Structures are given as C-alpha cells and as structure tokens.
C-alpha cells in the first residue's frame, strides 16, 4: 500500500501564530512495518548511526542508504536499523533506498515479525524531494498517511 | 468517521531505549475539521486561554458548562482554529460537560479546518483526562 508523505516547514511570528509550507511525496509501506499513519519531527540518522545519545520520543527517522558495496559487514541489516530506530523512540522510519534497492526485499523479508510502527521506503524523485529539504531546511515535521 | 486515540506514556532507559505504555480510547471526528490522522505531544489548554508552543502539538481542551462561561470569547469552533493557528497539529475537546458543543462544531461543517478536530465524552474522556491531568508528558496518536 502507498504512503503519502508530507514534509512541513514552519515559522512562528512574534505573536505566536505559525506559518507552514507543505511538500508532498509518495513512498511505500514496508511489510516489515505496520501500515499505520504517523507524524513527528524529523531526525536524519546516518546508517552508521544505527548500531544516551538520546532524542525526544516520537521522531521520524529519515535515512539515506549507502551503495551496498560500500558496506561489507553492516552492524545491522536495514531491518534491524529500523527496529533500532524504533527502540530509540522513532514514531516511524523512512529509508531512501535509491542507492540500495535490494533493501526493499530485505525489509519485506521481515513481515513475519513486523514492527508496530511504520517503515516506509522512498526512491527516485520522491526521495530527491525529501532529502533536499531534510538537508537544506532547518527543522521539519513529517506526516505519513493511509 | 470515528476516531481512535492512543495516549502514549514513555520512559527512556539507562541504555537510551524507550519503553512505552499505550492507553486507547475512541472519540469522533467533527465535520468542522479534516478527517485525518495526527500525532503530537499533548498540551492541555484551558478554554479561556484560547482567546509559546512547539509546532505540532495536540491540544487537549476540556469544555465546561455553558451556564458557567456565559460571555465566551470564541465559539468552541473558534477555539480550535485559534489552536491550530498556534501550531496545534490536531485539537481534542472533552465535551462531557458541554454536549451542545458537538452541534456548534458539526455546524462549521461546510467550511472546515485543515487539521483534525475530535470530541470525546463519557468514559473515553475520563481516561484521557485522567492521564493528561497527572502532569506527565504524553504523546497522542489519532487514527482514522
């Protein structure tokens, strides 16, 4: 099932009223994860960063995968990476699998013991759109639907 | 459209790992707001108080007898937009003591809010409020 992702940028005024800019994206839910919506602030984690460096409960991990031959022995599989994130309070995880499309099977290999939070992958222009904000922008919220 | 609400309590671990306790309850979407899911930290707002906050919160607002606030600053529908104006990702109203608020909300039906407005009552607001009241930090997940 397809996942609609929204990345929201926001400025307060001095008065306290907020002003937001939404960008829409389409990815897919992994069967490694629940098929629920989730929303929460974005944390960019390196894949080397998933093996008390704590973050507030309910963040949305955005993770750009590496060429797979640039990682002979991963500390964890991409499955275990998402599972780690969750243990550390990730409300959801989003992988950019543009460099590592084998990863989709690896995720969907874990459908026997799925996580109660959503694991979403994105490729192509929808990943491009995502990472371009996550990199440039200060600080963002993500909403994942349906 | 009925709304399923999970309230989440959580504790980090010596190892930086979280442990959660989730309490579920059922409420309803108002046609005055969008029928979408939403998640966010809970901020308890006092009704007088919607006439300072991190973007993406979920407002929990307990209404009171309309006999006791008889010069209201905004309609209850107004209070919700105000909350959204102030970064609320969704608003939850406990309408146990002002049941005619259902009516006001679902009357804004024709011109709605981008975010969800949900009303709860009875044993479901009792659960929600019995957590929110005991000043912990909590997360709210609202599900369509």
From Swiss-Prot, chain A:
Topological region Extracellular: 1-146
Disrupted-gene phenotype: Embryos die around birth due to activation of Wnt signaling pathway. Embryos display a lack of lens formation due to Wnt activation. Conditional knockout mice lacking both Rnf43 and Znrf3 in intestine show a marked expansion of the proliferative compartment, resembling the effects of acute deletion of Apc.
Location relative to the cell: Cell membrane
Described purpose of this protein according to its UniProt entry: E3 ubiquitin-protein ligase that acts as a negative regulator of the Wnt signaling pathway by mediating the ubiquitination and subsequent degradation of Wnt receptor complex components Frizzled and LRP6. Acts on both canonical and non-canonical Wnt signaling pathway. Acts as a tumor suppressor in the intestinal stem cell zone by inhibiting the Wnt signaling pathway, thereby restricting the size of the intestinal stem cell zone. Along with RSPO2 and RNF43, constitutes a master switch that governs limb specification.
UniProt subunit comment: Interacts with LRP6, FZD4, FZD5, FZD6 and FZD8. Interacts with RSPO1; interaction promotes indirect interaction with LGR4 and membrane clearance of ZNRF3. Interacts with LMBR1L.
Protein family per UniProt: Belongs to the ZNRF3 family.
Listed name of the protein: E3 ubiquitin-protein ligase ZNRF3
Residue span relative to the full protein: 54 to 204 of 913
